[PDB]
Design a protein around this ligand. Structure first.
Ligand code: NA
Ligand code: NA
Ligand code: NA
Ligand code: NA
Length: 328
DNA sequence: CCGACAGCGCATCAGC
DNA sequence: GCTGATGCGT
DNA sequence: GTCGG
């Protein structure tokens, strides 16, 4: 984990470029090209001396090497300095920090003179339900969640889920499950023996309802038969500053696909890419839902029975690795 | 050169 | 009213 | 923007 002082000027520049590609130019693949470059540079354990040096890293190409040369010689990038000053571009970029405001909504708002949170506050009728919640909790949603709060949040979720029906199985996944010291949100995977891919939904609703009844879930961004996305808040101790509101997702998953889901949503994203690779060369295709054998002509067969995460590792003769070990 | 860069749930729009 | 497309988040 | 068939 090299100190940011090493190439933090370069990685900051590439991340800022990334955001403008995503939010203003609506070029998601360039956004991800810049993010990939910033990640591989963020890991490089040497102070970069030239664009040509950076070009040797996978994901750094001709144009980024060129930008790195300009940044190293001048300490800035003319194109980035210009767009930073640009009133419509900076406002569009900023507004997309509201959950529910994407590039299209942010463009439309700025087009009609709505540029700041104050302007959004003044124009509630122009916001959909998701966007009102994102505005309401703009600051809270940008805070991280310390692991101790994630533990208290997990206590409530597991308790109330079991209270609804002790046969529910709930797992808090994400980097939290891998042991991380902070989280961006809470990702809950839910199943029940009565729910399989084949037959028979109110199983999700009952859990959301009970978490609302004990005043843990405070708002709903979206809710269907298999996926809930919303907002929650820990109760504050008597006479004490209140905890920030937090994003929580709850997904209902058929029992026979549950452990593929836990594996995938535990990650990390790098670990998943490797395991999928190792699965292919072993003759298996793994997605979020299933693991399947591949015949010699590539024809995917029926999904294989999975009753634990280890079942998946066993199929591809990989030793089971702890969530804390799944960084890569 | 030029296509891939993941797939999907839900809310909402666009078209009929 | 319905069906498929789009925006969005992930 | 970068990679690679
Ligand atoms: Na490169
Ligand atoms: Na955003
Ligand atoms: Na947004
Ligand atoms: Na019971």
């Amino acid at each position: 984990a090299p100190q940011e002082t090493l190439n933090g000027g370069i990685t900051d520049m590439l991340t800022e470029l990334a955001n403008f590609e995503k939010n203003v130019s609506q070029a998601i693949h360039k956004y991800n090209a810049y993010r990939k470059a910033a990640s591989v540079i963020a890991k490089y354990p040497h102070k970069i001396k030239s664009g040509a040096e950076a070009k040797k890293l996978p994901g750094v190409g001709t144009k980024i090497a060129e930008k790195i040369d300009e940044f190293l010689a001048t300490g800035k990038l003319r194109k980035l300095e210009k767009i930073r000053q640009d009133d419509t571009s900076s406002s569009i970029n900023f507004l997309t920090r509201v959950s529910g405001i994407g590039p299209s909504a942010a463009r439309k708002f700025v087009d009609e003179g709505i540029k700041t949170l104050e302007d959004l506050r003044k124009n509630e009728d122009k916001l959909n339900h998701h966007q009102r919640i994102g505005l309401k909790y703009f600051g809270d949603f940008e805070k991280r969640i310390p692991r101790e709060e994630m533990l208290q949040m997990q206590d409530i979720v597991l308790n109330e889920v079991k209270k609804v029906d002790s046969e529910y199985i709930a797992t808090v996944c994400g980097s939290f499950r891998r042991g991380a010291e902070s989280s961006g949100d809470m990702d809950v995977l839910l199943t029940h023996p009565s729910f399989t891919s084949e037959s028979t939904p109110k199983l999700l609703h009952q859990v959301v309802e009970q978490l609302q009844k004990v005043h843990f879930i405070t708002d709903t961004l979206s809710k269907g038969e298999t996926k809930f996305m919303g907002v929650c808040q820990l109760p504050s101790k008597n006479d004490e500053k209140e905890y920030p509101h937090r994003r929580i997702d709850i997904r209902l998953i058929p029992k026979d696909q549950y452990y593929c889901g836990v594996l995938y949503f535990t990650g990390s994203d790098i670990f998943n890419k490797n395991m999928r690779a190792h699965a292919l060369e072993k003759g298996f295709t793994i997605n979020e839902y299933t693991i399947r054998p591949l015949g010699v002509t590539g024809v995917a067969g029926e999904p294989l029975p999975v009753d634990s995460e280890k079942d998946i590792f066993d199929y591809i003769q990989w030793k089971y690795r702890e969530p804390k070990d799944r960084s890569e």
